[PDB]
Amino acid sequence: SETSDLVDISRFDTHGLGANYKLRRHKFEHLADTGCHKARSDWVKYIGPLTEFGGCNHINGNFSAVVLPLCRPDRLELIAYVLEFAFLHDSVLESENTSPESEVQAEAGLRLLYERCISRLLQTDEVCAKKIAKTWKDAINTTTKDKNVDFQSIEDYLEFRMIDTGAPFVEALMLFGLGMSLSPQEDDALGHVIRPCFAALALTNDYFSFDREIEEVDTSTLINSVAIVMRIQSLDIPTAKTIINETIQKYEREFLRRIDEYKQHKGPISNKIEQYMEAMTYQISGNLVWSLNCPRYNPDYRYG
Ligand SMILES: CC[N+](CC)(CC)Cc1ccccc1
Ligand SMILES: [Mg+2]
Ligand SMILES: [Mg+2]
Ligand SMILES: [Mg+2]
Ligand code: NA
């Protein structure tokens, strides 16, 4: 209980999500808010006017402060800056109304801030930074190539969606915040464990960001499991959302199973991998609680 405080997740209406996941909130949240502010200022300086919220949420906690509550305080500002640029660039990648001329116009500014992120990370922790650069580029490239694929099942969708939502990229940021690197063997084995975590994160995002993504569908590619379920099963919004809610609960339980299965088969586990597992579980609770009222998805929490 050094970088963060335990928060009782049962004080929030999580719609049955998050059972058996503990919630923590970083004590240095101000540093995350600072990173978000600076990234937003840099976006206006080099790219254009801001159109939306990113990770800030002063009520339930800045995204980085609740998703990555074990971050070293000296790394939290940079991580929040990187994620804020990712939140804003994400909407650019999904956009459909950008003229070719505007796309060309933004490119060098987006490149400047991308490279600024990578260079600052590399100067801080070269090993950890290389994993962030690799996963970020994979997320950007996969979104760009595959965002209009017509998926015919949630299972197929999720193999794209875990990359499109940047789950491996956030994992690489989390490791950076811990000052942690994994061996090639740990990487191989932990990938199996964290797959259901990535699915739960992506589907939870879909659940809480659906309304906003429909509001934007006139200018933005719709990438959302609730819509897939509506189409495949001919269901309305609340019924499809219930299916997605049940599916999140399935993946949440699966991740807890795989953590304990790893301990039972490949254990006693090191303190390092123990902290890795715990840190991954905090992404689930933090993502969930942040999404309930973040201004990005919830219009009556917006200002400015
Ligand atoms: C909602 C935030 N994010 C990453 C920036 C996409 C914009 C998806 C994500 C959520 C939680 C964990 C990992 C990825
Ligand atoms: Mg996206
Ligand atoms: Mg998006
Ligand atoms: Mg979304
Ligand atoms: Na969209």
Side-chain angles (χ1 to χ4, degrees), residues 3-10 12-21 23-100 102 104-106 108-110 112-122 124-133 135-136 138-184 186-187 189-259 261-265 267-304:
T3 64
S4 64
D5 293 296
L6 206 281
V7 179
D8 178 10
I9 193 171
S10 82
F12 299 90
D13 181 356
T14 62
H15 307 270
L17 307 180
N20 304 117
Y21 287 80
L23 173 66
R24 299 192 78 95
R25 186 167 177 176
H26 210 290
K27 292 174 194 174
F28 295 76
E29 181 172 355
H30 163 255
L31 300 182
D33 290 334
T34 296
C36 292
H37 174 90
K38 289 180 178 170
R40 293 174 74 77
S41 180
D42 284 345
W43 186 282
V44 173
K45 180 175 171 186
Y46 296 108
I47 300 160
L50 292 156
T51 62
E52 63 180 4
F53 284 85
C56 275
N57 181 346
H58 185 55
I59 308 305
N60 283 15
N62 184 293
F63 178 93
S64 299
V66 294
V67 172
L68 307 171
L70 307 187
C71 282
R72 236 169 249 170
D74 73 339
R75 290 184 181 191
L76 179 63
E77 185 183 332
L78 177 56
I79 289 169
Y81 180 98
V82 170
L83 279 165
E84 191 69 9
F85 173 73
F87 269 114
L88 302 171
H89 186 222
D90 167 67
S91 302
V92 170
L93 294 176
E94 293 176 45
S95 70
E96 291 172 338
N97 61 339
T98 304
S99 74
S102 313
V104 181
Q105 184 176 333
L110 295 167
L112 182 82
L113 295 183
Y114 175 87
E115 291 186 2
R116 175 178 292 187
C117 293
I118 298 309
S119 65
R120 294 182 174 175
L121 290 163
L122 281 167
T124 305
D125 188 326
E126 192 187 348
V127 177
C128 288
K130 284 177 176 177
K131 195 194 203 93
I132 297 168
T135 56
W136 199 357
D138 290 338
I140 294 165
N141 286 342
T142 298
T143 297
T144 298
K145 183 184 144 256
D146 288 339
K147 67 168 189 170
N148 277 117
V149 166
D150 186 29
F151 297 100
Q152 292 315 132
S153 70
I154 293 301
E155 167 181 297
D156 298 352
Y157 163 78
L158 281 169
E159 301 300 336
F160 158 79
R161 190 64 173 113
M162 68 169 179
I163 307 297
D164 169 67
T165 205
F169 163 66
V170 176
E171 181 210 1
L173 284 163
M174 183 198 74
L175 289 161
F176 174 81
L178 301 167
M180 183 183 295
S181 58
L182 306 179
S183 66
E186 288 164 342
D187 214 273
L190 293 169
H192 167 79
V193 178
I194 69 188
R195 279 174 51 79
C197 183
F198 290 174
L201 288 170
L203 292 179
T204 300
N205 176 272
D206 288 350
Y207 185 82
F208 289 105
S209 65
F210 176 86
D211 298 349
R212 167 263 194 164
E213 297 171 357
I214 295 296
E215 291 284 351
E216 293 315 310
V217 82
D218 54 301
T219 65
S220 184
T221 309
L222 183 59
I223 302 164
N224 194 303
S225 58
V226 173
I228 295 170
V229 169
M230 286 183 72
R231 184 185 73 248
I232 294 185
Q233 304 197 44
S234 295
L235 300 175
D236 69 13
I237 296 167
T239 308
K241 280 184 173 177
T242 294
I243 295 181
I244 292 308
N245 184 293
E246 290 161 4
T247 306
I248 295 159
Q249 293 194 46
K250 169 181 82 179
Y251 282 108
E252 285 175 336
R253 279 186 300 261
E254 180 69 18
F255 181 42
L256 297 180
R257 294 169 183 177
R258 295 192 184 188
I259 292 169
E261 179 192 26
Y262 180 100
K263 294 177 182 173
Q264 184 64 205
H265 296 349
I269 68 176
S270 55
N271 293 337
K272 179 183 104 180
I273 297 305
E274 175 56 42
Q275 180 178 75
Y276 174 87
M277 296 304 204
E278 291 175 18
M280 287 304 297
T281 67
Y282 295 129
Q283 294 198 34
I284 289 285
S285 56
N287 176 238
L288 169 58
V289 172
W290 171 84
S291 297
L292 305 180
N293 61 4
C294 64
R296 187 174 172 87
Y297 311 145
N298 296 288
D300 290 313
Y301 289 86
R302 296 174 185 165
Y303 48 88

